[PDB]
C-alpha cells in the first residue's frame, strides 16, 4: 500500500464511485443508449438500457482492474466517459508499477526514533543506562522537562530498565527492543565495529576528558599548551581517526531486491479471503431475497 499515499487510495475509490454514478445518469436520457436487445429478429419493439446501477459499478471496477467489462459503451457520451476513465486507469497503474519499482531498488530505512524527544512518548521502546553512572546521574539531577519524564520512567522501573554495566546493555539493545543511554565516544567505538547498532539523536550532555594533574603542579599548564599543539597541527584528530575507525561495512551499496515473500506483499492474501467471506454472506443474502420473492 506504500507507494501511493492513502489520500490517493481514497480519491481513487471515490473516483470509481463517482464516475460509475455519472455512468448511470448519462445512460438514461441519452437516446442512442437505448438499443434493440432482440437481435435475432428485426423489429420487435422492446427497449433496454443495460447500463443499470449495478453494471455501472461493474464497468468502473472492471475498467480499474485493466480487464474491462462486457459492456463496451455504445453511443458517444458513455464512450467519452468510458475512454477518459480508461486513460485515468493507465496513469494510475503505470504510476503504481513505476513507483513500486522505485521502492524495491532504493530502500530508505528510517528509524522510529530520531531524538530523545521521541523516546519521551514511545513507551514501547524502553530506556536504559548503566547503574549509578554519570549518565544516570545526569537525569536524576536534571531539570529539563523531557529528561524529567525520561527519568521518572527509569526511576520507577528497575532490573528491566536499568543495566549494571554497559557491555551488558550492548547485548540488550542487540537482543531486545532497548534504547541505551551512555557516553558519546563510547558509542562510536561500538557503532563502527558492530554494524547493526546506530547512534540516533545527538549529544545530550557536553563534558570532556582532561589530563589529570595533582592539586597544584607546573605540569598542568605546559601540557595544556602541548594539548593545543596537537589539535591545531591536526595530530590530535588523526589519532581519533585511527583508533575508532574499524571495518567500515559499506552496505550503502544496494543489494539485490531480496525476492518478495509473505512479509512483503502479505496482506493481499488477507484481503482475498476478506473478499471470499464477504461474498458468501451476500450469496446467502440474495438467496433469501429470491426465496421470499418466490414465496
Ligand X SMILES: *[C@@H]1O[C@H](CO)[C@@H](O[C@@H]2O[C@H](CO)[C@@H](O)[C@H](O)[C@H]2NC(C)=O)[C@H](O)[C@H]1NC(C)=O
Ligand Y SMILES: *[C@@H]1O[C@H](CO)[C@@H](O[C@@H]2O[C@H](CO)[C@@H](O[C@@H]3O[C@H](CO)[C@@H](O)[C@H](O[C@@H]4O[C@H](CO)[C@@H](O)[C@H](O)[C@@H]4O)[C@@H]3O)[C@H](O)[C@H]2NC(C)=O)[C@H](O)[C@H]1NC(C)=O
241 among annotated binding-site residues: no
| Helix 219-233 and helix 235-243, axial crossing angle in degrees, nearest 10 | 80
Q: Which is nearer to Na ion, 66 or 94 (CB)?
A: 66
- Within 196-255, the residues that bind ligand Y by CB under 6 A are 196
- Within 150-189, the residues that bind ligand Y by CB under 6 A are 175-177
Would you count residue 103 as binding a copy of itself (CB under 8 A)? yes
Instruction: At 249, give phi and psi (nearest 5°).
Output: 45, 75
- Cα 37 vs. chain centroid, distance in angstroms? 52
Q: Which is nearer to ligand X, 81 or 170 (CB)?
A: 170
Q: Which of 75, 161, 187, 223 lies at the binding interface for a copy of itself (CB under 8 A)? A: 75
| DSSP conformational letter for 40 | S
Q: Which is nearer to a copy of itself, 157 or 278 (CB)?
A: 278
Q: Which is nearer to a copy of itself, 175 or 280 (CB)?
A: 280
Q: Which of 189, 194, 201, 220 lies at the binding interface for ligand X (CB under 6 A)? A: 194
Q: Minimum Å distance from CB 6 to ligand X? A: 20
Question: Which of 145, 136, 243, 100 lies closest to 185 in space, CA to CA?
Answer: 243
In angstroms, rounded to a whole number, what is the distance separating the alpha carbons of residues 210 and 233? 19
Q: Which of 171, 231, 264, 279 lies at the binding interface for ligand 2J9 (CB under 6 A)? A: 231
Q: What grid cell was written down for 153?
A: 520512567
- 130 forms beta bridges with 163
Question: Which of 8, 193, 28, 2 lies closest to 99 in space, CA to CA?
Answer: 2
Would you count residue 228 as binding ligand 2J9 (CB under 6 A)? yes
Applying CB under 6 A, the residues found at the interface with ligand 2J9 are 206-208, 227-228, 231, 236
Amino acid at each position: 500500500l506504500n507507494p501511493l499515499s492513502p489520500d490517493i487510495w481514497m480519491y481513487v475509490l471515490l473516483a470509481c464511485l463517482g464516475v460509475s454514478c455519472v455512468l448511470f445518469v448519462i445512460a438514461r436520457f441519452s437516446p442512442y443508449e437505448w438499443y434493440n436487445p432482440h437481435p435475432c429478429n428485426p423489429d420487435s419493439d422492446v427497449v433496454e438500457n443495460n447500463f443499470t446501477l449495478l453494471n455501472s459499478f461493474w464497468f468502473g471496477v472492471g475498467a480499474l482492474m485493466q480487464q474491462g467489462s462486457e459492456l463496451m459503451p455504445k453511443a458517444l457520451s458513455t464512450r467519452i466517459v468510458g475512454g477518459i476513465w480508461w486513460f485515468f486507469t493507465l496513469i494510475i497503474i503505470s504510476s503504481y508499477t513505476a513507483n513500486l519499482a522505485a521502492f524495491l531498488t532504493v530502500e530508505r530505512m528510517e528509524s522510529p526514533i530520531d531524538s530523545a524527544d521521541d523516546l519521551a512518548k514511545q513507551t514501547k521502546i524502553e530506556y536504559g543506562a548503566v547503574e549509578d553512572g554519570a549518565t544516570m546521574t545526569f537525569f536524576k539531577k536534571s531539570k529539563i522537562s523531557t529528561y524529567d519524564k525520561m527519568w521518572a520512567f527509569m526511576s520507577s522501573r528497575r532490573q528491566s530498565v536499568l543495566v549494571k554495566s554497559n557491555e551488558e546493555g550492548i547485548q540488550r539493545v542487540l537482543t531486545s527492543d532497548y534504547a541505551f543511554l551512555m557516553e558519546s565516544t563510547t558509542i562510536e567505538f561500538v557503532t563502527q565495529r558492530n554494524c547493526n547498532l546506530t547512534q540516533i539523536g545527538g549529544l545530550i550532555d557536553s563534558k570532556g576528558y582532561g589530563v589529570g594533574t595533582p592539586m597544584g603542579s607546573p605540569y598542568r599548564d605546559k601540557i595544556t599548551i602541548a594539548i593545543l599543539q596537537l589539535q591545531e597541527e591536526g595530530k590530535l584528530h588523526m589519532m581519533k581517526e585511527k583508533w575508532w575507525r574499524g571495518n567500515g561495512c559499506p552496505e550503502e551499496e544496494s543489494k539485490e531486491a531480496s525476492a518478495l515473500g509473505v512479509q512483503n506483499i502479505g496482506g493481499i492474501f488477507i484481503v482475498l479471503a476478506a473478499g471470499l467471506v464477504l461474498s458468501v454472506f451476500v450469496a446467502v443474502g440474495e438467496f433469501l431475497y429470491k426465496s421470499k420473492k418466490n414465496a
